[PDB]
C-alpha cells in the first residue's frame, strides 16, 4: 500500500511549508504601511468612449505605445482602436466568434486571440500586401483558451481550461514547453516585467509561479476560497495580485511566499473579473460583476475610487505603459478611457 | 490634418461594415445543443440538415446557428455565460440508457446535467427543447428489462406509452422555475422527420415573446 505512505508523507511535507511560511511572517503589510499617507479620494472621468462593438467585450490589451489598443467581442470582430482620436485603425473578423482573450505584441506588428476553439491565432498587422491576415494558428490545447501573452515577436505563452499552460514557438507552431500542475482550469496569466517568469491563477483557487526557460513550477500560492479569475504582476516584478470569485483580492509576495494584504469589503458580494496595477503600483484597479470597476490603495487596502460608468459586468481592464489612462471594457459593448 | 482627415473617413468606412455585419448577425437564430455524448445529438444534427462545432441550417426563411460544446470536458460554469442570449437550448437524452451505466446509470447522469442547465442563473427564461431519442430501442428494451432498474419508485406497466410518459414527467419535474420558463418535450425516432419543425415552432414562441418585450406588452 504505497499510496497510503505517499499521501501521509505529502501531508507532513505540506505542513512543513506552512510552518516555514508562518515563521517568516514577521508582521503584516497593513502594519508596515500604517504610517504611509492615504491616497485620498481618487476621481476619474470618462475621457473617451469607443463604440462599434455589437456584443459583449471579453478582452482588451494596450499596445506598448500607450495609444493603440485591441479589443475582442463575441460579434466576431477584433477591433484596433486609436485611443486619442477614437479612430478605428483596423477591424479583424475572427473565424470563431467565441473569443475570450486578446494580446498585443510588444513589437506592435502582431495581435493574438483565442477562445472556445482551443486555438490561439496570430495576426500580422504590418503586411505589405494591404490588409491584415492571419499568420499562425497554434493548436494543441485540449480546453478553451483563457489567456495569452506575447513573450516576444516569435514566442507566446497561453493558458487553457485543460489545467495546463504552454509556451509556443510561432515560427514552427509547436509547444516548446508545457507547464502542468494545476488541478482546475487556468483562467489567467501574467508575464513578469523581465519576461523570465510568469504567474497563473486557476479554478483550484491556487496560483503558481513558473519558469519559462526550465519549464517547471517554482512556488504555489493558496488562500482563495474560489476560482481565481484574474492575475496581474506588480510593477516591481516580485509580487502579484489575484482576483477571485469570492469577491476578494489578495496580494502575494514571491520572495516571502505568502499573501500580504486582502482587498475585500462587506458591501461587495460579486466576484472580480479583471485586475490591473497602476504605473507606480500604488493603485490596484479591479473590475467587478456589480458593474463597477473599483480602485484600491494597494499599500493600505483601502477603497479609493469607483469607475462607475458601465451598465453591465466589467469584463476587462487595462492601464497604459505610460500610465496616463485606464481603458475599461464591459458586457454593454463599450470601452471607456478614464483620466 | 490632410492625413488626419483621410484616417477619419477610413474609420467611418469601417463603421458601416460593422453595422452591416450586425444587421446580418441579428437575423440568425442561435441554439445551444447539449447532451450526454451518446444521446444521439449526431442524429439530431443530421436531422436538421476540436473545440466547439457550429452547424448551419435554414427552415422557412429563418437562419439557425447550432453550437455543440460536447468536446469541452472542462468546467461548464466558466464558459456557459457565453451562450446567455441563445433563443433556445436543445437538450438531447437517450431513452435507451435507463439501465446502462457509465456505478451510476447513464440516465441519472443526464438528469444531473439537465437539472444543472435548467436551473442555471444564466438560463432563467430561455426555452428548453427536450429531445428524448432512441425511442425504437427503448420500446424493445422494456419488453425484456424493467424501468425499475433506473427508477426504483416506478410503479406502472412496462408498456411504451406508460413508461415513456413517466420518464418525461421526471425530467419536466426538475424545472424549478415553472412560471418563467417553458420546457418543450418531444419524442424522437432515430429514422424520422419533422423534428426541425418542432424546433421552429418553439423558436417562434420565443420570437413572439421577444417582440412583445419591445412593444411593452410582455
Amino acid at each position: 500500500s504505497e499510496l497510503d505512505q505517499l499521501r501521509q508523507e505529502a501531508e507532513q511535507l505540506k505542513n512543513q511549508i506552512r510552518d516555514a511560511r508562518k515563521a517568516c511572517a514577521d508582521a503584516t503589510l497593513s502594519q508596515i504601511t500604517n504610517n504611509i499617507d492615504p491616497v485620498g479620494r481618487i476621481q476619474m472621468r470618462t475621457r473617451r468612449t469607443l463604440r462599434g462593438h455589437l456584443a459583449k467585450i471579453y478582452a482588451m490589451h494596450w499596445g506598448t505605445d500607450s495609444r493603440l489598443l485591441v479589443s475582442a467581442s463575441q460579434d466576431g470582430k477584433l477591433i484596433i482602436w486609436d485611443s486619442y482620436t477614437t479612430n478605428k485603425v483596423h477591424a479583424i473578423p475572427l473565424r470563431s466568434s467565441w473569443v475570450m482573450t486578446c494580446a498585443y505584441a510588444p513589437s506592435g506588428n502582431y495581435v493574438a486571440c483565442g477562445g472556445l476553439d482551443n486555438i490561439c491565432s496570430i495576426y500580422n498587422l504590418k503586411t505589405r500586401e494591404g490588409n491584415v491576415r492571419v499568420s499562425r494558428e497554434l493548436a494543441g490545447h485540449t480546453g478553451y483558451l483563457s489567456c495569452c501573452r506575447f513573450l516576444d515577436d516569435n514566442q507566446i505563452v497561453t493558458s487553457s481550461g485543460d489545467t495546463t499552460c504552454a509556451l509556443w514557438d510561432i515560427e514552427t507552431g509547436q509547444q516548446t514547453t508545457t507547464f502542468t500542475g494545476h488541478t482546475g482550469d487556468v483562467m489567467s496569466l501574467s508575464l513578469a516585467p523581465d519576461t523570465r517568469l510568469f504567474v497563473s491563477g486557476a479554478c483550484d483557487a491556487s496560483a503558481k509561479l513558473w519558469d519559462v526557460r526550465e519549464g517547471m513550477c517554482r512556488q504555489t500560492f493558496t488562500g482563495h476560497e474560489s476560482d481565481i479569475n484574474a492575475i496581474c504582476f506588480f510593477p516591481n516584478g516580485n509580487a502579484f495580485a489575484t482576483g477571485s470569485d469570492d469577491a476578494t483580492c489578495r496580494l502575494f509576495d514571491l520572495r516571502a511566499d505568502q499573501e500580504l494584504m486582502t482587498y475585500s469589503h462587506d458591501n461587495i458580494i460579486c466576484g472580480i473579473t479583471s485586475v490591473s496595477f497602476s504605473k507606480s503600483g500604488r493603485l490596484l484597479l479591479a473590475g467587478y460583476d456589480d458593474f463597477n470597476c473599483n480602485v484600491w490603495d494597494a499599500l493600505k487596502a483601502d477603497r479609493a475610487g469607483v469607475l462607475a460608468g458601465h451598465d453591465n459586468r466589467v469584463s476587462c481592464l487595462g492601464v497604459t505603459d505610460d500610465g496616463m489612462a485606464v481603458a475599461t471594457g464591459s458586457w454593454d459593448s463599450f470601452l471607456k478611457i478614464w483620466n | 490634418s490632410a492625413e488626419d482627415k483621410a484616417a477619419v473617413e477610413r474609420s467611418k468606412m469601417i463603421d458601416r461594415n460593422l453595422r452591416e455585419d450586425g444587421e446580418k448577425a441579428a437575423r440568425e437564430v442561435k441554439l445551444l445543443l447539449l447532451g450526454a455524448g451518446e444521446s444521439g445529438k449526431s442524429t439530431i444534427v443530421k436531422q436538421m440538415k476540436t473545440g466547439i462545432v457550429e452547424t448551419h441550417f435554414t427552415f422557412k426563411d429563418l437562419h439557425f446557428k447550432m453550437f455543440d460544446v460536447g468536446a469541452q470536458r472542462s468546467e461548464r460554469k466558466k464558459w456557459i455565460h457565453c451562450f446567455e442570449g441563445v433563443a433556445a437550448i436543445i437538450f438531447c437524452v437517450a431513452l435507451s440508457d435507463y439501465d446502462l451505466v457509465l456505478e451510476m446509470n447513464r440516465m441519472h447522469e443526464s438528469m444531473k446535467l439537465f437539472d444543472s442547465i435548467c436551473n442555471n442563473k444564466w438560463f432563467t427564461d430561455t426555452s428548453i427543447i427536450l429531445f428524448l431519442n432512441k425511442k425504437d430501442l427503448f420500446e424493445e428494451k422494456i419488453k425484456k428489462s424493467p424501468l425499475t432498474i433506473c427508477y426504483q419508485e416506478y410503479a406502472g406497466s412496462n408498456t411504451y406509452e406508460e413508461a415513456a410518459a413517466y420518464i418525461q414527467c421526471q425530467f419536466e419535474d426538475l424545472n424549478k422555475r415553472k412560471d418563467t420558463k417553458e420546457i418543450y418535450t418531444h419524442f424522437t425516432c432515430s429514422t424520422d422527420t419533422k423534428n426541425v419543425q418542432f424546433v421552429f415552432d418553439a423558436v417562434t414562441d420565443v420570437i413572439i415573446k421577444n417582440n412583445l418585450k419591445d412593444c411593452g406588452l410582455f
Partner: single-chain antibody
Amino acid sequence: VESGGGLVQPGGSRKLSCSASGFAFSSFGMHWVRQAPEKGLEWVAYISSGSGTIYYADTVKGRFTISRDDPKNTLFLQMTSLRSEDTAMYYCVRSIYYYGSSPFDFWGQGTTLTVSSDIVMTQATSSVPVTPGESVSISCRSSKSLLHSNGNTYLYWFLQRPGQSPQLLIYRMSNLASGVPDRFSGSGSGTAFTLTISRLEAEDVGVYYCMQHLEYPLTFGAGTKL
C-alpha cells in the same frame, strides 16, 4: 505591381488606366502624380478609399477626371482638353491613411503621353559631386512650417533612380520606409529639412525629390541630382 495607359495623341482627349495587382486595392487611396520630360514631379489628382473625397490639381481642375473601379482593380484618369503644357510621364501611386501608415509607399511604372495659396518647396541645390563613400547631405525648405498640431511634420522624401520610378525613402520626415537601408536619415525643424546618407553606394545616384502633405494642393521640390 501596376501599369497602363496611352501614349500618342494630338490636341484632344484621352483616358489613362492603372491595373493594381495583389495589395488589396479597395482599401488604398490612389494618386496620379506626373513628371514632365525633364522637369520635376507634380501632383495631378486623388481619389480616396471608397471613392469619397476627390481632389485635383489647380492647373487641371476642370479638364481632368479621376475615377476608380474597385472590382477588376483598375484606376482611371479621364482627360478632355489636352494642351501642350501637360505632356508628361504619368505615374500611379498608392497611399493608405491610418495612425501609423506610410503613404506614397509604392509607385507605378508610369506611361508617357505627348501632344506634339500653395506651399512651395525650394530645394535650392541642384547637383553635387558624385564621389562615393562620403556622407552626402541634401537640404530642403518650405514656404510655411508644415508642423501640424498633432505633432508630426508631413514631409516625404523620394529617390528616383535613373531610368525607373521614384521610391519612397522617408515619410513624415523622420520615419524610414520599409526595405530602405539604414544609411538614409531624415531631420527637420518644421521649415528647413535635411536628408542624410551615411556611406553612399553606387545605387544611391539619382534625383532626390521632397514632397509635402500638409495642405492637399501638395507640391514637390524640383529635385536634387547627384
